[PDB]
Symmetry: C4
Subunit: 364 residues, 4 copies
């Protein structure tokens, strides 16, 4: 039944109009300054970077999406086996369903079988921490796929408009998280799910010992939109309310600035509407350590293994083109390449007290 | 015959194209900062607030609209009985017509019969104070519905383009108002009617002892548009002039900033184009104490009692969603939640001498 | 054949698409702050103002347009006789044609016959001052209509794209103008013709003793557009060049700011795209002493005497509405009423060194 | 093969939709302030200016485009013979092809035969300097057309998306360039090719002794677009990546500011999307010494000799009109005429540390 929500999610995300629906990443307001004389050759560009204790080929990850049933597991298999081939890390979808029903454990375990070397990242929802999940459930999720880290997702926006949502985010869940990090063998990433991390949220999380964030800003997959659709589907009256919140949240680019600025030493994934290597480059240049993608990976994986390899090839090339044309020989150079910030993103930062000068210093 | 204007008003407002016609609230320029970790549960959100001496369930009021005849009174009945059920305060329409003709007194009295506990707010027009209304007419309007307060409306824009308008706002009417507040048992609210309160007007009113304002800014019901339509209807030449003034006035959001800034200790209703709980939340967060609605309430009440209950349910839910997602446990927290101010609203405030730093201080 | 240009001008201006073609007044960037409590009555609004030695009913003038032939003179008759009735001043079109051919003298003389009391303003082009016009031609034009002042028009943009244009503006023409003002019985106004006065131009003119300006900015009648059309009409290749300059010039609102700021004690007419009393009010509020109109007056006059009276009635009413709603009892109050300056106009002023604070001081 | 790319380039540029495709020059953000009193006559406007050791009639050049085959040479012949007639300098296309195959030497040599007096500018690509071109190849290209200077083009963006591109820009190529300037009889100009020169690139080039730049910014011919088309044409997968980079680069206007600001004493050609004399005037006023055009010259030359003479006539007239209407008697006056900078260009400059005050000083 929760496994039904799992298929509905994938089905709506893949085939319905929810990518950037009434939302914006603000990435249009970010411009990488072209360098007519790059000072490097294309083939000497090096895209390698660290991902905790491992090394990855490209500063891009597939962020968690699905699992919990068979056709969901065979998607996870396609994603993971291609991810392995390209040396890029992969998060799995929420593992709640695999703690609840043991038949679902396979659709997540397949990932480590077929991707033995890349970082794999586990996934559990924050609301579970208030509803009695603790150290052992976390250890289960982790060692079920031999995870290199665990992602705890923030989705209060989604839970609110969900027909069946559990919108409970009592502060005590953070005390519990902080305790679970005491004795977890792997690091915790806190990620949003299409609505973005603000500087108040980041600072709070940091004050409880969280050092790794994933922006998941608005302008990508619109989870409010997805739940609106589920609501329309069962004539649930919340549908119309959801419509009014379609553009709620921190746009991805704003979130990257906000997190980097408020917690300078963070490890930061810039995600939420990354659709090209150009988007990925902007996010990294803007302040992220790596870029994250979900929806476009799903869409390719559904079409098949080679479709997804073609996709990763395209992303990688686009990224390298952006690096080439900014004179960035490696990921570190990209992180400090010249940018222009315009428009609504500029106004956002100004109002939010982000000093553009001290910001430029912090991102390098 | 003035009872004809009363039906025409309702008929045009309800069924013709006048909501936000060529006008804007500037509320698009206000963004509530999403909090991925709210720190509260949805069901522990408390929406209660004070409304003078009484307590109300939700920081929302129905602002005055109509009365003066029978089908107008049965609308007032539907509005008031639903308002009672939800614990939200209700203003009645201008009571001039009930001071003039005694047959109209019923269409206002019904309100207190069917809504014994919520705050009810009386209504008289400012131009009447120049045309010989005084303490007794005020007391009449008040005790005719056992009002908890009286709203005196400013409508010079409307009076100008009205075919039959009385555009007289001599300063002496304020001396009279100030004298009437001497010996009125209830407080006075001064409200606009679709064209907004500026800081010059607020400061003037304050200097005469008025402490409670209702912004009624542009971007909602367009009263200049309504009178243009009445003018077109009787081939009155003023119709075309009215067309040129369709976007005249202070946008709601600007007005809320202006009044809060210029009179910090005011009790402020933020109204004019509030159409969702999101709009209500923005207005409160921006600086209002409560949000006010008229037109969408009318439209639902015309459709029937349950239609209106469905409407209030939707508004309330939307509001609580906004509170949830900003980590606002109660109305006070919402009043000091994080916002972003962009675009034309920002330019408006900057030009008008509204220091954004001292503004942030004042709203908290 | 210069009398042919005269008819072509009127015919194109009246019946072809040239009003605000690709141009803008920037008046949308000027907002008059609505006053919910005006503090005055509509009927006590006084619209009288000085126009040199005379007094006029309304702070509006009809700026010069035509004359030089019979159907042109009967337009001038309609304009002047209605202008007399309303107590508003009128400029005539360029009188070159009446100095050249004596048969054309009637189409200008009719104006003083039918309008004995209002200020009448003569008209000669600046390029004539380089081509041997002097004190006597000026005196001729003046006493031919018993002018209360003479307007000398700047039209280099127009002359450039004119098929037959004389684009000669040698500095020496100013020495000559300065000398002609020595012994002229009436004041000189220098006006543009759809392309606006900059602060460099105003300062220069001032340094030669000119104290009265008429902005005639872009966003109204587009003279480059008119000459483009004349060019298209005789397959003259300049047509396409003219197309590229369609938005050349200082927008009216920018010009008003520029002239007022650079020459604070100037008498300033704000003209170029004034189409409503609202436009007129904005121009005056912005810094003009009076507002000027040409094209919409032509269009009405062509339709007939009563059509034009209806037009002036509409303009006057609109103006008084703007005054009413800003609490402006008279023209002086309007000149210092509260405004907001946004958008492109704001950027224009900032770049041009117009300090917004010292500007606010100067306009009062 | 390489001579095929040469024809394809011309064919796509001339007949396909690639001029300003998804790109912008930002020239809309530059406004020349109109002067109602120019202070000059149109016929006394002098458009002469220096181009290294020679004098040219107009501050405009034809920047390099083509050559390498016969129908390409007869285009070069039309361009050069008209350029001679008008006294405007002409760059040739890349001469790589004429170093490689001797049959191609004629299509470049024709230029000096038919244009004996104007400056002719040679052309070689930067990537050739890493691939073993040196002093002798440069001297070949130079004396093959008796060049007055040599342009070395930067095209890394193009090389990246080219199906057959050589994206190699190792720093060592600059050491080589700097050495080649040791013993070249003529000056070197470094030009981009549709993607613009940034201040980092300019400063770097300057630090290696380069003093002459050609902005070739985005908003004109879109070379990424051209290669996308070549890619689509051979089902090369890069096509879709190129689509994501269609608006990559420094807009022309931004580039002119950037180069002028970062290297004040530079000789600067402002090119990339110059389509009218108005565009040319803006570029010069903005900070360029001369304006450069390519695509519109190609398009006319393809139509024939007289078509191209008509084109240069139109450009020249437009330029003089702009000069007239800003009171610019000569090129120097235009270089210091009054401008307004708005919009996205303003934001670009502000973020990039271009102080608008010190900028105004530098451009005069
Ligand atoms: C079908 C599907 C299902 C999920 C998601 C995505 C999709 C499309 N995402 C959210 C995802 O990781 C990401 O943060 C956002 O979707 C924004 O990225 P994109 O815009 O999709 O690239 C997600 N996040 C998470 O932490 N737990 C979950 O189980 C899921 N579920
Ligand atoms: C039919 C109708 C009639 C009235 C009104 C409204 C409507 C729709 N409103 C104005 C109202 O209280 C409010 O200030 C504005 O309409 C802006 O709010 P909305 O945009 O309608 O939510 C109103 N105001 C008032 O003070 N006296 C009046 O009698 C009325 N009349
Ligand atoms: C038919 C016609 C002919 C003329 C004009 C206008 C029209 C429409 N105007 C220009 C006019 O006075 C004014 O400055 C501009 O037209 C801008 O005002 P409007 O936009 O027309 O209100 C004008 N100006 C002038 O000084 N001498 C002239 O003879 C004329 N000729
Ligand atoms: C057909 C064709 C071919 C070339 C070019 C252009 C065209 C249209 N241009 C680029 C040109 O000089 C200029 O920098 C850009 O095209 C921008 O100017 P326009 O937007 O074309 O005016 C060019 N540049 C260069 O340095 N070497 C080359 O051989 C060519 N090739
Ligand atoms: C984008 C996202 C976080 C999806 C999972 O949410 P959910 O509440 O359906 O899953 P679970 O309840 O298993 O966390
Ligand atoms: C928005 C508003 C005040 C409507 C009532 O106007 P009116 O002029 O019909 O009211 P009254 O009955 O007080 O004249
Ligand atoms: C707008 C304007 C100034 C029109 C008169 O121009 P013109 O050149 O036709 O008139 P004249 O030849 O009389 O200067
Ligand atoms: C715009 C431009 C530089 C076109 C020539 O590119 P190319 O790579 O064909 O030049 P080359 O012949 O030097 O490789
Ligand atoms: Mg959950
Ligand atoms: Mg009334
Ligand atoms: Mg003339
Ligand atoms: Mg090459």
């Amino acid at each position: 039944d929760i496994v039904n929500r799992k298929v509905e999610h994938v089905e709506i995300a893949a085939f319905e109009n929810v990518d950037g629906l009434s939302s914006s990443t603000f990435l249009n307001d970010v411009i990488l300054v072209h360098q007519g004389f790059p000072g490097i050759s294309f083939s000497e560009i090096n895209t390698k970077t660290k991902f905790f204790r491992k090394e990855i080929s490209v500063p891009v990850m597939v962020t968690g999406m699905t699992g919990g049933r068979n056709e969901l597991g065979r998607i996870n298999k396609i994603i993971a086996e291609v991810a392995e081939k390209f040396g890029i890390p992969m998060g799995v979808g929420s593992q709640r369903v695999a703690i609840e029903k043991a038949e679902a454990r396979e659709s997540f375990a397949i990932v480590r079988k077929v991707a033995p070397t890349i970082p794999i990242i586990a996934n559990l929802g924050m609301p579970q921490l208030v509803k009695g999940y603790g150290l052992k459930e976390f250890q289960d999720a982790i060692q079920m796929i031999e995870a290199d880290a665990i992602a705890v997702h923030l989705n209060p926006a989604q839970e609110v408009f969900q027909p069946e949502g559990e919108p409970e985010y009592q502060i005590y869940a953070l005390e519990k998280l902080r305790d679970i990090s005491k004795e977890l063998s792997v690091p915790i990433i806190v990620k949003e799910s299409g609505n973005g991390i603000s500087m108040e949220t980041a600072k709070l999380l940091y004050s409880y010992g969280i050092k790794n964030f994933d922006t998941s800003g608005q302008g990508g997959t619109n989870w409010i939109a997805i739940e609106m659709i589920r609501d329309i589907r069962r004539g649930n009256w919340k549908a119309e309310s959801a419509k009014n919140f379609l553009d709620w949240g921190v746009p991805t680019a704003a979130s990257i600035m906000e997190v980097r600025y408020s917690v300078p030493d963070s490890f930061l994934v810039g995600s939420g509407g990354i659709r090209s290597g150009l988007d990925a480059a902007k996010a990294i240049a803007l302040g992220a350590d790596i870029a994250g993608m979900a929806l476009p990976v799903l869409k390719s994986a559904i079409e098949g293994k080679e479709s997804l390899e073609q996709f990763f090839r395209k992303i990688i090339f686009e990224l390298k083109a952006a690096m080439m044309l900014t004179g960035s020989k490696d990921v570190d150079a990209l992180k400090k390449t010249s940018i222009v910030i315009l428009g609504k993103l500029k106004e956002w930062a100004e109002y939010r007290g982000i000093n553009l000068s001290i910001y430029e210093k912090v991102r390098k």
